[PDB]
Design a protein around this nucleic acid. Structure first.
Lengths: 92, 84, 106, 100, 92, 104, 78, 99
DNA sequence: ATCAATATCCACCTGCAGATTCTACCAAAAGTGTATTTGGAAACTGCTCCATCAAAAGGCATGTTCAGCTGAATTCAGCTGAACATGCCTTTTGATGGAGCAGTTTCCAAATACACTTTTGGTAGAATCTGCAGGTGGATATTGAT
DNA sequence: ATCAATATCCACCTGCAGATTCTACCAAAAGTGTATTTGGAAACTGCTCCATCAAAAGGCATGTTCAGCTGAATTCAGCTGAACATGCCTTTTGATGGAGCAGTTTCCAAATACACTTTTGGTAGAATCTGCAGGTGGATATTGAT
């Protein structure tokens, strides 16, 4: 039956940054590959971080360090800024 | 009138020149086409070996796109656009 | 009491719950903390936003309204960081950057 | 009779094919090669190939060849030549790590 | 309280070169090597089990992981030895 | 009565099982998997110590040092390919001078 | 003095000799200091990132091995 | 008075240093460079370094420089030169993927 | 060739620092038995999707000829980089002081997992909508000849 | 330079294939209460590493001279590209059978969880091995002037 993807969320963000702009299905496929790739890279690094320090929990501290090791430069600064803001606004 | 007995010869000279043009190559030695076929054959042999291994581990007999994507991944290449 | 998504309470579009599941399901660690999927979802949303901004810009430069893989390829390789991050990534039907070296020119 | 100097058509083709994204190897010869190579590994039992599997492999193969051509040609210019030769491709392969 | 593969490396060393020793730095190299080989095989087996939506890593995933990560003759020998060890273990 | 004993191996089948369960690879670890893993680890260790000892003897030394391991790796086609991105501390490099470089 | 200049001509020539280089241009040494600086910057940034995740103030050998691992280099012996 | 031809000693040195495994940059300048780079990156926090961390970093940096020299020198020979030059290193880096 | 100059090879030697062996007692993993839970194979099963066969039909590949352009080979002069000597200066070695910083135990609050149903939100077709592919033409730009 | 030939650029158009919108049912996220864990705080070791201070100790910086290497210049035979002419090979909808692949059940061999007795592998000392470095001398080997 079902195959889930990030299509709906990619589309919401797309309409947020280019409202009159659409996207083809092939472009949507490479966007799903990209989102799965970033997630696997971050989660893999977070898993390794937690393992090195003999902890069994992946927390936002591990996600944030994983971002800082895997993303280049300014992308990393923005990404940790946005994640930090999300966790702050979520606690409420 | 000459007829094909090796499939790699189906990779024709003009196809290889189109690839080389996409690579920005301006002048091509005539020895390039068989060198390129050799390189391509080796690339295909490795990737297909790995993809078929992914197939036979899944107890399947149809190589899927994900088999090929996983094979490329295991050769250090990430292919986008076929996880659908 | 009525329910609001974790994405609602974090201020995001990406699915916090689904991300949390994907963290539990992927055998990354025996336990996953509460903020980890919030943080992960925010990063995914940001990355998606950045890549869609660059890809949308390429779409406009080629007088198109619809993003196609070619625009995603141009977005990648014209951006220093995006290019470094996705250096080993092939975009099906993406082509290459128009690039002729100086020597080759008439 | 009008006829272009050698290299003028070459430059025009470079611009042409760098603006496009189409696959440059014909589908059927490539897939026939693919299935022939595949039959070698299977001992002769035969596997089917999703259409998307064959076009995924062709995308990857063509991207690989184009990028190898980019590197090899850098080496060509480095030898103060303009014609790609097999030694340029072999040396690019060795430096990438593929036959190091 | 700090474990390694030293004892086992030394056992195998004495089986294949009985008159031969090994300096502590070379033993460190050997320990890194075994952790690297283990991490590679286990990683590929984990991914194989994920791709096929199975939750158990069996010797079948190990054998496929070997056939994907080791080159040629090393994989041929390695699968022989793994098959023989597991068969001989099955016989109680 | 060890699992290694009735597996016929020197490498510790139990410890491999623990490192597989504790390493976050999968929720369940089968019975034959740590046996097979220990068997491979032993075989791989075996081939590499065999080659490295041979190099130690080629230098008429009795003790394996990192140099002997480096020579073992890079002189063997398949090992060298498997450990291609691996650096061996104080291993040095293979003696190799290009032909164009030597006089006359 | 400058700290990068402590990596001297003869050291860089010994490295090139191990690399089988027979003749060296006088411009090579400043290029090599540039390259070595870039390499050390990346490896040290990541290693300190790893240390500082562990709430330590001593970067270990394992932090450095992990840094090299995350840029594709596997270091044996620590 | 005895004098070797240019290239004879250089070959002798290639053989010497390809036979050896010692670190070839002297320890203290290298470690001073690393501590300078680290203090620069921590933006004023100062970390200490296990002896083994400094020696691991030096083993890796030297293996990296040696292999960059091998590759770049392949490019040198390809240009039918014998003198390694900066453009050889720059091209080798562009082709490996390091930029 | 001849020989002189210099370097490297090979056989010794014997301590000393590093490797090996040994004794130990100990948590600590590994093994065992048992009491359950479960994941995954076997057995259909409906149903896509993959293979194949049709043979036209145009879209490309192939082969030949000829112009002109390149890679290879050769020479040579200026100058860059190698070789070699000295002397001092930065590094290496060894101990030393002690500050700070890892590493170990041990409580407990806080954070996470679990298990029970409640609500949706996301997916999958089906029904609407529309941007772009492929074809055409005119204008611009580029090229080649003189 | 002009002047002609040719190609590429760029916008028009319309119908349809692909995109977007729309509708509904259930996997799955959310809620609440509850029942394990954990990772951290606090607290005394001990390393470990940073700073220092000598003096021994080799290695780096500096200078001089010339070999021979790089970069420039020149030639030419063969090779590669451009252009054109045929003929084949890949493309292209359709059709059909069916292979093989998801989707569902049903359990049962296999894995997990818990609470037990034992065996092993790691550490700290220590005794006891040896291997190899470093130093010496003399025997071949390599290089270079002639």
């Amino acid at each position: 039956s079902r195959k889930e993807s990030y299509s709906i969320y990619v589309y919401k963000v797309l309409k947020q940054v280019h409202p009159d702009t659409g996207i083809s299905s092939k472009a949507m496929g490479i966007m799903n590959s990209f989102v799965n790739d970033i997630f696997e890279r971050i989660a893999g690094e977070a898993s390794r971080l937690a393992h090195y320090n003999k902890r069994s929990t992946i927390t936002s501290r591990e996600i944030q360090t994983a971002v800082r090791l895997l993303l280049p430069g300014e992308l990393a600064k923005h990404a940790v800024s946005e994640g930090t803001k999300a966790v702050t606004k979520y606690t409420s | 009138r000459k007829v094909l007995r090796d499939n790699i010869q189906g990779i024709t000279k003009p196809a290889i020149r189109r690839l080389a043009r996409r690579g920005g190559v301006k002048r091509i030695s005539g020895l390039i086409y068989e060198e390129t076929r050799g390189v391509l054959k080796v690339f295909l042999e490795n990737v297909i070996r790995d993809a078929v291994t992914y197939t036979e581990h899944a107890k399947r007999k149809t190589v899927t796109a994900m088999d090929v994507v996983y094979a490329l991944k295991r050769q250090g290449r990430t292919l986008y656009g076929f996880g659908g | 009491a009525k329910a609001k998504t974790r994405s609602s309470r974090a201020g995001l579009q990406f699915p916090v719950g689904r991300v949390h599941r994907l963290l539990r399901k992927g055998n990354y660690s025996e336990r996953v903390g509460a903020g980890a999927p919030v943080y992960m979802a925010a990063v995914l949303e940001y990355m998606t936003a950045e890549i869609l901004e660059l890809a949308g810009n390429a779409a406009r430069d080629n007088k198109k309204t619809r993003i196609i893989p070619r625009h995603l390829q141009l977005a990648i390789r014209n951006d220093e960081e995006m290019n470094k991050l996705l250096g080993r990534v092939t975009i099906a039907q993406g082509g290459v950057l128009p690039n002729i070296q100086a020597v080759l020119l008439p | 009779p009008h006829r272009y100097r050698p290299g003028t058509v070459a430059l025009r083709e470079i611009r042409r094919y760098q603006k496009s994204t189409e696959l440059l190897i014909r589908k059927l010869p490539f897939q026939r090669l693919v299935r022939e190579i595949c039959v070698k590994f299977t001992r002769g039992v035969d596997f089917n190939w999703q259409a998307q599997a064959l076009l995924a492999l062709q995308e990857a193969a063509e991207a690989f060849l184009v990028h190898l051509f980019e590197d090899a040609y850098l080496l060509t210019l480095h030898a103060k030549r303009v014609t790609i030769m097999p030694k340029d491709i072999q040396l690019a392969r060795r430096i990438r790590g593929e036959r190091a």
